[PDB]
Every structure is written in structure tokens, then in C-alpha cells.
Design a protein around this ligand. Structure first.
Ligand SMILES: Nc1nc2c(ncn2[C@@H]2O[C@H](COP(=O)(O)OP(=O)(O)OP(=O)(O)O)[C@@H](O)[C@H]2O)c(=O)[nH]1
Ligand SMILES: Nc1ncnc2c1ncn2[C@@H]1O[C@H](COP(=O)(O)OP(=O)(O)CP(=O)(O)O)[C@@H](O)[C@H]1O
Ligand SMILES: Nc1nc2c(ncn2[C@@H]2O[C@H](COP(=O)(O)OP(=O)(O)O)[C@@H](O)[C@H]2O)c(=O)[nH]1
Ligand SMILES: Fc1ccc(CNCc2ccccc2)cc1
Ligand SMILES: Fc1ccc(CNCc2ccccc2)cc1
Ligand SMILES: [Ca+2]
Ligand SMILES: [Ca+2]
Ligand SMILES: [Ca+2]
Ligand SMILES: [Mg+2]
Ligand SMILES: [Mg+2]
Ligand SMILES: [Mg+2]
Lengths: 352, 54, 425, 438
């Protein structure tokens, strides 16, 4: 009989894992403050890692990796990529980004202008996009004056990265999209990629001559279901699954999803998680960690995959909650606390 | 990776390696604490003896 | 040298006390005449805790036998180990207490109390560093209940900073002598709430149910009930009588077991309890499961009806100290809904190498559970059923008491219940 | 030569002190009767070992130590033990009854009645010193004497010896080897009143020592003898520079100079390697690189915590045995290229290294195996604040209900001292977050 506590009631993912754990008749839930737990479904912010692994005789496991924010913060991910020799500033799959602190507070203001002034003179496309983790607030513009003036009007760290002006557009529609891949890293630091991804598509025709109307450039589910007028026309809920996206690539470009995109996705996921492994691994620690990650990618018209961001507390597509959450229990929880396939994951083998 | 101040003797040696440069109560006050606590104990005990005498 | 002065008062108090000294005297190798005839130095390591060393290597219990009638103490003096007691330590009267708390506390007992204190004083003066006192008594009679609590109040006046520990037999209508037992028990609980530091609640009904249902005794007797109290007293005092870690003095026990001064009434327990399938070895899991099972508890309170504030467990014998820690953490980590979570690590375990006579190993359980409130609810209910009609009160008002004194004792016991109920939530 | 007086308070301090002085004697060739043949200057001398040992006309080398316990049973062991002849009676001080795990009892009730006596016994040792450096104070956090009397003793020492350094070796409470529920109270009360009196304190978590004994020594259920012998090795590595020829940490002042940038942040993390079981058929002797890399494994730390998620303010490497500077720097290079070693911007990213050629001594028949080389790393990391958080959390759970508070108030302590002490620990935790986090 195992015990777990719930410290994030808003997690739609672990609400199901918690629902499944109880349904097994071999797990029991305790008050959120009871320390005699085997498994912690912890809070998103200020998770008390320092109190784990100090209960005599209790193998304790938590659903977050201490230190993973270095990957799931806009500014942290930029600093991690430019400063890590494994990733380097020559990293070919991450957009040219810069950390920019508002003038009311290191910083990369001048370096951005140097590269910016370089594109303007070379007749090249010089459209950027500024954003921050403290947003629901995004601004796309080809003028450097508007990007920096927008960050000074705020008060949190921002990052300006090159806007992919030549994205891959689905047909019919001429519309943008992004790809969300779910990744589970277990206590042994095996990287598991869930076999089911989803594309969050824009129901509006892409328009490179008007960044003011941000409905055809941003593919977020809330923006499309609120400010877009063609929501749910092509695919149900602006969500297209891999089976359809793969068939489309075969009929249109005569290529498969595995060859043209998935190989680069699996490479980016491996590169990022292997980089921070020495810093976050719980191999020789007094407690164990696993975490579910949501990687967001962009695909350009050359079939090159770009990394957008990494989410540390990701939600899931409605149609995939069941399969994925059961997978979490199998390889992440029951692997440490066994009960009394054809795995839904793809192990990305690496040199620990 | 620099080494400085290497000191060597018969029973060992010591040195320093730099990898990167940077960027009370008086005796009287204590006596009061102790005697204040002792007095509070005597007050509590006197109340108990009073309770018992009743 | 942390000596303890033992006092036994009244019929129940002296019969249970007699068996206690009989049991531990055997464990320490002391024969009925006080002479030592053991074979292990562990039997003398802490022997001075309960025994005074007289001339000729004789060991005399540091015990005082008190009663208002001679009958029961004549039995002790003619019992198995009767010769072992210091003759001067028999203090008795002739009139008796008639199962009347007021006689033990105000009239008959008052006349005799000063000579009891003279003996307590003598025993204390012969202690290098007195730890405190333990008293065996019942709450439903007159001498052990009434005079017993009177002694405690007068001992507190003279040794206010020493520990006062009691083994208190709670009455039950199932093992009853008179209808006034709820009266006497409620008046005593009032004293105990205020003037003891630790009270082991021994419910005669739980002792009966154990003898009947578990031990398969068709007709249990006081003698059978007292065998369980002997084994329990031997178990709870094992930490004091044999070389045990954590020092284990009554003052450290109270500090770590009593988070609130009034809530100092413990549920004791013992394993094994086997019926004559008695030669079988008992594994550590079995010891632990039984020790935590309600059927093995002497207070007749279902621990699942409340929560544990603190728990002490003493294992005796040569066993796997690793396997003990595993099973103790297993019982905790499998029922953590019955342990308050605002007292970290409130379950402590101690091991002793010397097992009880005739057992390869055993476990004694000491629990401070809010489920003990059900014992006081029982007494309160029985008390009010009679007191609302003022039935049998004349036995008490005839000795000078007023009804008000009953109303106050009742209110304090019901307050104790409410206090347990608030920490259970 | 400058003298250091060691003070052992309570059961933990005394028994740990017992283990250390056993080791000191074996390291310096001193016999239980007090004789030291290798000492050619009879009845005196100003050698390195004389900082910890005085000498009589008869050639007896006497520890400069005071053992203090409010109960006699633990110190009675020393009085009749193997090393009874090392100490004279004035050095062993015992009371009648202990503090019952009650900080307030050891500090106020009992402490008030024995403090002047302990100072007078300490004053006697000080009169034998031509240049006293300071004091090393061993005690537990959880015991009533270890917590309560120690804080009182530290305040008095600052009054009588204002210009003297004071180091602590403090045992952090672990439930696996303790039957005391109130130790979180005692730990925070004693840290509050001792904080401004301690220049440098080495916390040893019994949980860490316990797991090292089970994992590396294959002891299923370790005893206090197993724990203290391992603790004395670490203590010996830390005090070796004061007792032997050398140039690093040569006086108690240097521990603060090298390990403490701010007065309140004076709790360095200790890490020790290697710990090898003596019952091993035969072990593969570890190199300088392997034992140095091991100084960044949490399983060898005296306090379980994750330095990867803190910042370093100082780092000391203390090697004993076959170790030359060349192999040390080679190992350090390999560690900065694999470990997460984040220093604060206002501190140099570096390591002070000390090497003593004499390999660690091991008590005959003990649990530890003879190793050709060993190291103890002393690093000031913000990650050690994890141990304050754990302790402060347990404190808050009980104090919210006022559980056990009546025992402390009953000894004359005012309830407000609880919250005053707790608020000071809250301040300490904030100081670590300001230094470590961005
Ligand atoms: N490492 C180690 N810890 C010990 C030792 N003895 C006691 N402890 C720890 O110290 C704490 C209890 O405090 P003690 O030192 O025994 O108590 P005290 O200082 O003698 O004070 P009193 O309450 O008066 O007895 C517990 O956390 C024990 O685990 C020891 O020999 N070695
Ligand atoms: N460098 C870039 N080039 C092109 N488009 C970009 C871009 N950066 C962001 N986008 C657009 O913005 C969207 C992703 O925004 P982002 O993920 O940074 O915000 P967010 O984190 O609040 C949403 P999420 O829930 O996925 O974390 C994508 O749909 C993408 O089309
Ligand atoms: N367990 C046990 N209970 C007893 C014994 N003798 C009496 N009692 C109980 O104690 C109460 C009677 O008190 P008693 O000791 O006889 O009165 P006293 O002599 O005036 O103190 C009743 O509740 C009895 O059930 C005994 O030997 N063993
Ligand atoms: F286990 C016990 C159960 C009940 C009792 C009380 N009855 C004792 C008795 C019975 C008949 C004649 C005389 C006395 C005592 C012990
Ligand atoms: F550890 C201790 C805890 C509590 C106490 C209080 N003793 C009260 C008392 C003394 C004598 C007779 C009756 C009551 C004493 C020590
Ligand atoms: Ca008369
Ligand atoms: Ca000399
Ligand atoms: Ca000072
Ligand atoms: Mg995001
Ligand atoms: Mg009777
Ligand atoms: Mg002690």
C-alpha cells in the first residue's frame, strides 16, 4: 500500500493520475501537509524539495525535477543555450534570441541591435518577436524601436527572438501551426517521448503583410478560440493529430512525419535534457524525481524544425489524457512503487 | 587555473588555486535573565502551594 | 542512581502491586527472601531503581503497602514473596473504607495519611537521587481511589518537582463490586487530571474481554486479570530496570509523551497474549501487528476511534532490531490517519535484550491516544445516570461532602473529554 | 604555539569527545597512561601537538579538555574507561540529574546552578596557556544539556574571553537515532542564542552519519560507537592543522577568515571520502581524482542537501596521506568541467588546499579501513540552509498547537522566546536566499 499527497489542485494531468492511482486499490491519498508520503504531486512554484527524502524508511518520489526551470523559462532557456558548449550559440535549431531587461531595472540590448542593424542593411527579413514568461502579451514587429519601447513599458525580463517569417502552411487554408510533444523523464533519467503529438493550428490564413492582427500568427488555443473567426473549421478544436498530419505530408510533399520532422524533434529533446542532466539528475540523491515536459516546435517551409519553448507544467489534448496519464503511472510511478504493450513511449537512448 | 602561496614543510604542504576572480550581553544582563526565570519558577510553585494549602 | 518509590493502596492496589514485585523480582533474580540468585550482571545494573540494598547482599523492595483494613495486606504478608517486604512498610487501619471515596479521602484516610508519609519520607531520604513515585490502585473503591489520591496531593506538597506516576484500574459494570464505582472513579479522575504526570489507564472490562475472548478463559477471576497487569507493569518499566539506551528516566518519558499537561492518560498494551499453541515462536511482524491491535490494549478504547498524540513501543528479547524498525515504520506508514501529523516523529521504539520470564520475545505498547476519551465518556454516563437522581449520595454527604464537589468533578472530566476531542480534530 | 581548549557538553558532546581524544592519542603516539615516547622534551614544550595537550613533570600529556554533563552516567565511563589516566578529576564535571531534553531546564534551571563551576574549571586550563586561541565546543542540538547549557556557556565565554574564537561541532537531530520529539524546539532555541557567539560551526546530521555507516560500512543498525568513530575522523581532519606542522588553518581565526564571509553565515558543509568497510576482503585504493570528485557527491556529506542548487562562498580541501599538488589540480580541472559548481559573484572561484602526508589513523578493531589517502572538503554553500528549513518546518507544526510548550514555560522560560528564536531562524533563511538565489 502506497501513499501520495496532492499539492496542485489545478493540474488536469495529475488529477487523472491521482484518479487512476486510487482506482488501483493499492494507493491511498493523504492530507497535503502529511509528510509520510511515498509520492508527491507537488505545487508549481516553490516546491519544498529540501524536505524530501528525510522520512526514515519511506522511498519518496516527486513529479518535478529541481532545476528544470532553467529549461522552461524564456530567459533561462536563452542563457542556457548560449552558455552551454553542448548547445552553444551556434545551435542551429533554436531561433536567434536575446535577453533584454527593461530600462527600469546580464542584458543583451546592444548585441541585439548589432545583429538587427546587420539584417536591415543586408535587405534581409528583419521581423522579430518580443515575449516574456509573465504573459497570458506578445508583440511582432519589423522595427527595433517598437520592440524595445514595448519592453520598457513593462517590468519583467523579456526575450527578443527572430520571428520565423517563412513558416510551413497547411493546405487548404494557408495557415500556420505549432507542434506539441510530450516527454516523460523518469527517476533513472530515461527520456520517453509520447507517441502521440498534436498540432495547434491557426484557422486564419497567414498574412506576412500585417503583424497587427495577431490571430493568424499566434497558434495558441485560447487566441484561436477567442479572437479567430474560423475556429474548428478544418480540424476539431484547431487540433490535428499525428495520423492526419502524416497522411497529409505523404499526399502533399511525398514524405513521412517520421523522416521530415520527428527525427529533428527527437534530436532537440535529447540535446536539451542531456545538457542539464548533471545539474538536475536525482541518481545519487536522497529522493527521486520525474517530470512531464511539453516541448513546442515550429516548422518552416524547408521542413526544418525549430524549438520555441519548453513547458514544465504542460496540459494535454483532451483526446489523449487517458492514454498518456496511464503511461505516466506505468513507467514513472509504478516503476518505483510496483503494484501487485507495446509501450506508448519512444525511449530516446543516450549515454548517461 | 593559478597556484599561489605554496608552503612546504616536512609533514605536508598547502597552497591555493584560483579559477576565476570575483566580479553581546554583559555578565550583568545574563544574571538578570537567569534570575528572572528563577523568579517565574518560584511564582508558579508558590501558586501551587497556595492551591494545595486551600 | 535514579530511585523510584513504589506505593500500593487498597485491595486492588496491593494485589496488583504484589504480583508486580513477584514478576520483576523474578526478572532480577531476587528470591522470596530478598537474596540474589541470578546469573547475569544485567539483573543488577539498575536493580537499585526499585530495590534497596540491605545488609548481607539482601534486596528489599522500595515499596509502601497502604490499606484502611488489614485483610488484604495479611494476604500479601502470607503470599509468595510476602517476606521480601520491609515490615515497617505495612501501614494499615482497621475500620475500612466501605468502597467510599469520601472515607478514603476525608475521614478514615485522613487519620492514617500522616503515618504513610512518614514512611515515604524515610524511603526518599535513602535515595541518592529520587526520580519520583509510582502508585498502584483502583479508582472504583474507597482506599486506593480516595486515600490514594489524598496521598498524591500530600506527596506533591513535599516533593513538588518529582515525578508522580500511577497505574489506575478503571471500574467497569462487567467487573464490578458496587454501584458507587462511577462516583468514586469520577472523584479520582478529578485528582488525577491535576496531580499526576503519567497515568496508565487499566480498564477492568478490557482485561475481562481479553481473558474471555482472547485467552479463552470461561470464568475469569481477579487473579487472571492481575496477571495481565503484572505483565504490563513489567513491560512499561523495562526501560528503567535494565540497561537501555536513551537513558530512559521518567522525566524524559513525560517530556516526550505529554504535549499538554492534562492529557497524560495512557493506553497500555502487551504482546503476545496466547491461550494454552503457546510454544510457537512469534515473529516481529506478529508482535507489531498484535501490539497495535485494539484487542491487545488494556483501556478498552478502540484506537481507530481517535488519534495518537505520541506512541512508545518497547520490544524485549533478542530479535532483528532492523526488522523491528521496518515493521514499526510499516505500521505507521500504513495507518498514518491515526497519528496526528503536527507532532513529527511521534512514534519511538526501544529494544531490550532480556525478555520476560518464559517468552523468547515480547512487546509492550504505551499510547497517548485521544481515543481514551471514550473511557471517560463511559464513566461520565454512568455517573450522571445516578447523580441526576442523587442516588446513593447519602454515603458521601454522610462523610461531610457536598453535592457541589460532585458537580465540579463531573465538569472537569467532561472538560477533559472536550479537550481530547479538539486535538482529535 | 597557541593552545586550544575543547569543551564537550552533554551526552553527545562527551561521547564524541571520547572518540576524538582516542584518535588524537593514536595519531600523536600518546598512550592511555598519558606517556608519549616520541616527545623528547619532557615536562613541557611548544610543539604542534601541545596546542591540544599539556605536559606534567612526569611526562604525562594531558588533554586541554573539559567534559561537562548534568548527569553522571556518561562521564563515569571516561573516569573508569581505557583513557581514565589521561584526564585528572577537575576535567570531568557531572551533575545529579539531566535536563530531560528540555532546553529551558538545561539553560535556566540547572545551568544557573553549575555555570560558575564550569567556568572556574575552564579558567584553570586557561591559566596553563601562554596564548589561548579559543575553544572548540562539541554538543548536540536536541539534548537538554547539549542545547540549553551550551548556549549559556557560549554567552559566558564571550564575556570572560571576549577576544577568543569559538568553534562548534554540533549534532543535528535525526529521528532514526533519537527518541526525543521536542528536539526541533531545542535546536532552534540554542541556535538563536548561540548564533552571535559562534564564529564557525560544523553541523553534523545524524541522518547522514547513519546512512554512511549502513551504506559504506555495511552496518545494518549502527550504534553510537559506530557513529562517533566516523565523526571523530571528520573532526580529526578539521583539527589536524592545529595539531601538526602546516600553513593552512593554523589557528582558529583562519577558519572564519577562509570559510565565513558574513558572521551569521558560519555553517560550512563538511564532506569526507573515502569511507571503506574494514570487513571488505580487499578494496581498490582510490586516487586523488576519485576521492576529490567524491567530495561533490551528496552521499558523503555531513548534511544531506544538494549543493548543485546553491552557491559557494568558500571551499577548503584537506587531504591526508599520499597526495601531491600536481594530482590535486588535475582532479579540480576535471571537476569544474563536469560538476555544477556555482560561486557567488563577490567571491573568488577557487580552492584552498591543505595536504598532510600522514594518512588517516584508524582505531584498531574499528569499522573504518586503512586508506592510503583521504580528503575532507569544507565548503560554505547556501544549500545547507535546506537543513534549517527542515528543522524550522518541524518547529512550526508543533508550535502552532503549542505542543510541549508548557514544559519550557514550567522551567521559567517565557513563551515569547519561542517566537523570537523562530523569527531569527526565519531571518537566517532569508539571508541564505539573498546570497544563493537570483
Ligand atoms: N552522533 C551522536 N549523536 C548522539 C550521541 N548521543 C546522543 N546523540 C544525539 O543527541 C540527541 C539527544 O541529546 P543528548 O546529547 O543525548 O542529551 P544531553 O545533551 O545529554 O542533555 P539531557 O537532556 O540533559 O540528557 C539525539 O538527537 C541523539 O541522537 C552520540 O554519542 N553520537
Ligand atoms: N520565433 C518565433 N517565430 C515564429 N512564431 C513564433 C515565434 N515565437 C513564438 N511564435 C508563435 O507564438 C506561439 C507560441 O507562443 P509561446 O509558446 O512563446 O507563448 P506561451 O508560452 O504563453 C503559449 P504555451 O502554452 O505553448 O507555453 C506559436 O503559436 C508561434 O506561432
Ligand atoms: N484488576 C483488578 N481489579 C480489582 C481487584 N480488586 C478490586 N478491583 C476493582 O477495584 C474496584 C474496587 O476497589 P478496591 O481496591 O477493592 O477498593 P479499596 O480496597 O477500598 O481501595 C472495583 O472496580 C473492582 O473491580 C484486583 O485484584 N484486580
Ligand atoms: F474477572 C472478574 C469478573 C467479575 C468479578 C466480580 N465478581 C466477583 C465475585 C463473583 C462471585 C462471588 C464473589 C465475587 C471479578 C473478576
Ligand atoms: F518530570 C517531571 C514532570 C512533572 C513533574 C511534576 N510533579 C508533580 C507531582 C509531584 C509529586 C507528587 C504529585 C505530583 C515532575 C517531574
Ligand atoms: Ca476514627
Ligand atoms: Ca614536549
Ligand atoms: Ca564574540
Ligand atoms: Mg509558456
Ligand atoms: Mg474491595
Ligand atoms: Mg544526557
Amino acid at each position: 500500500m502506497y501513499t501520495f499527497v496532492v499539492r496542485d489542485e489545478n493540474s488536469s494531468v495529475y488529477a487523472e493520475v491521482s484518479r487512476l492511482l486510487l482506482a488501483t486499490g493499492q494507493w491511498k491519498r493523504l492530507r497535503k501537509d502529511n509528510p509520510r508520503f511515498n509520492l508527491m504531486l507537488g505545487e508549481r512554484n516553490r516546491l519544498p524539495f529540501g524536505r524530501l527524502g528525510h522520512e526514515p524508511g519511506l522511498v519518496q518520489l516527486v513529479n518535478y525535477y529541481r532545476g528544470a526551470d532553467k529549461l522552461c523559462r524564456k530567459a533561462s532557456l536563452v542563457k542556457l543555450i548560449k552558455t552551454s558548449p553542448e548547445l552553444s550559440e551556434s545551435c542551429t535549431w533554436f531561433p536567434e534570441s536575446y535577453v533584454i531587461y527593461p530600462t527600469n531595472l546580464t542584458d543583451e540590448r546592444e548585441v541585439f541591435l548589432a545583429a538587427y542593424n546587420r539584417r536591415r542593411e543586408g535587405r534581409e527579413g528583419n521581423v522579430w518577436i518580443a515575449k516574456s514568461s509573465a504573459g497570458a502579451g506578445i508583440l511582432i514587429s519589423s522595427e527595433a524601436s517598437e520592440l524595445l519601447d514595448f519592453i520598457d513599458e513593462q517590468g519583467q525580463v523579456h526575450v527578443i527572438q527572430k520571428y520565423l517569417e517563412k513558416p510551413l502552411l497547411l493546405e487548404p487554408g494557408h495557415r500556420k501551426f505549432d507542434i506539441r510533444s510530450w516527454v516523460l523523464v523518469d527517476h533513472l533519467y530515461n527520456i520517453y517521448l509520447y507517441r502521440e503529438g498534436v498540432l495547434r493550428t491557426s484557422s486564419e490564413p497567414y498574412n506576412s503583410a500585417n503583424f497587427q492582427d495577431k490571430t493568424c500568427h499566434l497558434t495558441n488555443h485560447c487566441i484561436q478560440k477567442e479572437y479567430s473567426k474560423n475556429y474548428g473549421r478544418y480540424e476539431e478544436g484547431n487540433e490535428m493529430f499525428f495520423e492526419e498530419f502524416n497522411q497529409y505530408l505523404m499526399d502533399a510533399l511525398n514524405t513521412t512525419l517520421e523522416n521530415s520532422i520527428l527525427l529533428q524533434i527527437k534530436h532537440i529533446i535529447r540535446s536539451c535534457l542531456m545538457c542539464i542532466e548533471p545539474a538536475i539528475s536525482t541518481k545519487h540523491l536522497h529522493y527521486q524525481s520525474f517530470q512531464l515536459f511539453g516541448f513546442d516546435f515550429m516548422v518552416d517551409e524547408e521542413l526544418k524544425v525549430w524549438l520555441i519553448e519548453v513547458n514544465g507544467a504542460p496540459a494535454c489534448a483532451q483526446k489523449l489524457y487517458a492514454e498518456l496519464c496511464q503511461g505516466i503511472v506505468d513507467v514513472a510511478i509504478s516503476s518505483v512503487f510496483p503494484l501487485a504493450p507495446t509501450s506508448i513511449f519512444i525511449k530516446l537512448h543516450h549515454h548517461h | 587555473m593559478e597556484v599561489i602561496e605554496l608552503n612546504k614543510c616536512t609533514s605536508g604542504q598547502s597552497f591555493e588555486v584560483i579559477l576565476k576572480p570575483p566580479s553581546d550581553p554583559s555578565l550583568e544582563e545574563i544574571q538578570k535573565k537567569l534570575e528572572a526565570a528563577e523568579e517565574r519558577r518560584k511564582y508558579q510553585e508558590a501558586e501551587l502551594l497556595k492551591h494545595l494549602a486551600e | 542512581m535514579r530511585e523510584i518509590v513504589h506505593i500500593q493502596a487498597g485491595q486492588c492496589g496491593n494485589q496488583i502491586g504484589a504480583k508486580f514485585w513477584e514478576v520483576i523480582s523474578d526478572e532480577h533474580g531476587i528470591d522470596p527472601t530478598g537474596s540474589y540468585h541470578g546469573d547475569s550482571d544485567l539483573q543488577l545494573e539498575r536493580i537499585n531503581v526499585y530495590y534497596n540494598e540491605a545488609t548481607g547482599n539482601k534486596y528489599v523492595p522500595r515499596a509502601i503497602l497502604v490499606d484502611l483494613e488489614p485483610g488484604t495486606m495479611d494476604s500479601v504478608r502470607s503470599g509468595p514473596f510476602g517476606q521480601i517486604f520491609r515490615p515497617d512498610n505495612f501501614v494499615f487501619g482497621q475500620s475500612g473504607a466501605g468502597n467510599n471515596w469520601a472515607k478514603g479521602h476525608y475521614t478514615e484516610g485522613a487519620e492514617l495519611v500522616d503515618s504513610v508519609l512518614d514512611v515515604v519520607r524515610k524511603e526518599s531520604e535513602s535515595c541518592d537521587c529520587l526520580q519520583g513515585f509510582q502508585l498502584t490502585h483502583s479508582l472504583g473503591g474507597g482506599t486506593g481511589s480516595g486515600m490514594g489520591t489524598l496521598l498524591i496531593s500530600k506527596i506533591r506538597e513535599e516533593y513538588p518537582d518529582r515525578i508522580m506516576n500511577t497505574f489506575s484500574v478503571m471500574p467497569s459494570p462487567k467487573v464490578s463490586d458496587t454501584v458507587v464505582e462511577p462516583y468514586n472513579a469520577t472523584l479520582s479522575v478529578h485528582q488525577l487530571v491535576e496531580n499526576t504526570d503519567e497515568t496508565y489507564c487499566i480498564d477492568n472490562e478490557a482485561l475481562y474481554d481479553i481473558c474471555f475472548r482472547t485467552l479463552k478463559l470461561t470464568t475469569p477471576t481477579y487473579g487472571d486479570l492481575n496477571h495481565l497487569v503484572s505483565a504490563t507493569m513489567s513491560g512499561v518499566t523495562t526501560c528503567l530496570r535494565f540497561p537501555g539506551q536513551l537513558n530512559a528516566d521518567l522525566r524524559k518519558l513525560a517530556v516526550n509523551m505529554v504535549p499538554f499537561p492534562r492529557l497524560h492518560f495512557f493506553m497500555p498494551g502487551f504482546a503476545p497474549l496466547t491461550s494454552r499453541q503457546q510454544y510457537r515462536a512469534l515473529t516481529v511482524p506478529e508482535l507489531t501487528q498484535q501490539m497495535f491491535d485494539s484487542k491487545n490494549m488494556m483501556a478498552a478504547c478502540d484506537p481507530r476511534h481517535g488519534r495518537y498524540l505520541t506512541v512508545a513501543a518497547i520490544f524485549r528479547g533478542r530479535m532483528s532490531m532492523k526488522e523491528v524498525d521496518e515493521q514499526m515504520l510499516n505500521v505507521q506508514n500504513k495507518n498514518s490517519s491515526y497519528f496526528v501529523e503536527w507532532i513529527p516523529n511521534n512514534v519511538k521504539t526501544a529494544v531490550c535484550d532480556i525478555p520476560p520470564r518464559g517468552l523468547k520475545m515480547s512487546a509492550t505498547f504505551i499510547g497517548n491516544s485521544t481515543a481514551i476519551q471514550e473511557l471517560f465518556k463511559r464513566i461520565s454516563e454512568q455517573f450522571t445516570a445516578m447523580f441526576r437522581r442523587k442516588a446513593f449520595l447519602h454515603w458521601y454527604t454522610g462523610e461531610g461532602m457536598d453535592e457541589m464537589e460532585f458537580t465540579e468533578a463531573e465538569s472537569n472530566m467532561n472538560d477533559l473529554v472536550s479537550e481530547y476531542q479538539q486535538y482529535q480534530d | 604555539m597557541r593552545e586550544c581548549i575543547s569543551i564537550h557538553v552533554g551526552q553527545a558532546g562527551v561521547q564524541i569527545g571520547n572518540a576524538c581524544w582516542e584518535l588524537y592519542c593514536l595519531e600523536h603516539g600518546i598512550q592511555p597512561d598519558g606517556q608519549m615516547p616520541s616527545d623528547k622534551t619532557i615536562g613541557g614544550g611548544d610543539d604542534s601537538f601541545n596546542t591540544f595537550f599539556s605536559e606534567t613533570g612526569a611526562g604525562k600529556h594531558v588533554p586541554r579538555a573539559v567534559f561537562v554533563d548534568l548527569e553522571p552516567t556518561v562521564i563515569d565511563e571516561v573516569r573508569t574507561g581505557t583513557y581514565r589516566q589521561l584526564f585528572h578529576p577537575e576535567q570531568l564535571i557531572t551533575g545529579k540529574e539531566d535536563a530531560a531534553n528540555n532546553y529551558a531546564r538545561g539553560h535556566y534551571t540547572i545551568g544557573k546552578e553549575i555555570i560558575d563551576l564550569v567556568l572556574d574549571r575552564i579558567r584553570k586550563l586557561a591559566d596553563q596557556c601562554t596564548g589561548l586561541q579559543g575553544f572548540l565546543v562539541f554538543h548536540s542540538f536536541g539534548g537538554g544539556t547539549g542545547s540549553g547549557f551550551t548556549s549559556l556557556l557560549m554567552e559566558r565565554l564571550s564575556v570572560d574571553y571576549g577576544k577568543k574564537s569559538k568553534l562548534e561541532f554540533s549534532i543535528y537531530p535525526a529521528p532514526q537515532v533519537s527518541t526525543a520529539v521536542v528536539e526541533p524546539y531545542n535546536s532552534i532555541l540554542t541556535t538563536h542564542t548561540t548564533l552571535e557567539h559562534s564564529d564557525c560551526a560544523f553541523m553534523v546530521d545524524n541522518e547522514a552519519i547513519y546512512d554512511i555507516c549502513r551504506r559504506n560500512l555495511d552496518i545494518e543498525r549502527p550504534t553510537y560507537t559506530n557513529l562517533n568513530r566516523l565523526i571523530s575522523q571528520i573532526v580529526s581532519s578539521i583539527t589536524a592543522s592545529l595539531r601538526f606542522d602546516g600553513a593552512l588553518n593554523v589557528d582558529l581565526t583562519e577558519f572564519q577568515t577562509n570559510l565565513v564571509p558574513y558572521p551569521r553565515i558560519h555553517f560550512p558543509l563538511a564532506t569526507y571520502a573515502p569511507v571503506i568497510s574494514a570487513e571488505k576482503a580487499y578494496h581498490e585504493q582510490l586516487s586523488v581524482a576519485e576521492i576529490t570528485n567524491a567530495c561533490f557527491e551528496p552521499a558523503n556529506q555531513m548534511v544531506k542537501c544538494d549543493p548543485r542548487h546553491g552557491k559557494y562562498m568558500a571551499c577548503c580541501l584537506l587531504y591526508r596521506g599520499d597526495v601531491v599538488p600536481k594530482d590535486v589540480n588535475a582532479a579540480i580541472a576535471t571537476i569544474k568541467t563536469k560538476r555544477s559548481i556555482q560561486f557567488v559573484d563577490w567571491c573568488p572561484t577557487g580552492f584552498k588546499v591543505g595536504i598532510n602526508y600522514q594518512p588517516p589513523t584508524v582505531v584498531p578493531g574499528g569499522d573504518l579501513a586503512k586508506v592510503q589517502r583521504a580528503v575532507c572538503m569544507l565548503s560554505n554553500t547556501t544549500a545547507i540552509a535546506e537543513a534549517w528549513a527542515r528543522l524550522d518546518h518541524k518547529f512550526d507544526l508543533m508550535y502552532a498547537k503549542r505542543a510541549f510548550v508548557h514544559w519550557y514555560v514550567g522551567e521559567g522560560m517565557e513563551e515569547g522566546e519561542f517566537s523570537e528564536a523562530r523569527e531569527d531562524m526565519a531571518a537566517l533563511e532569508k539571508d541564505y536566499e539573498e546570497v544563493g538565489v537570483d
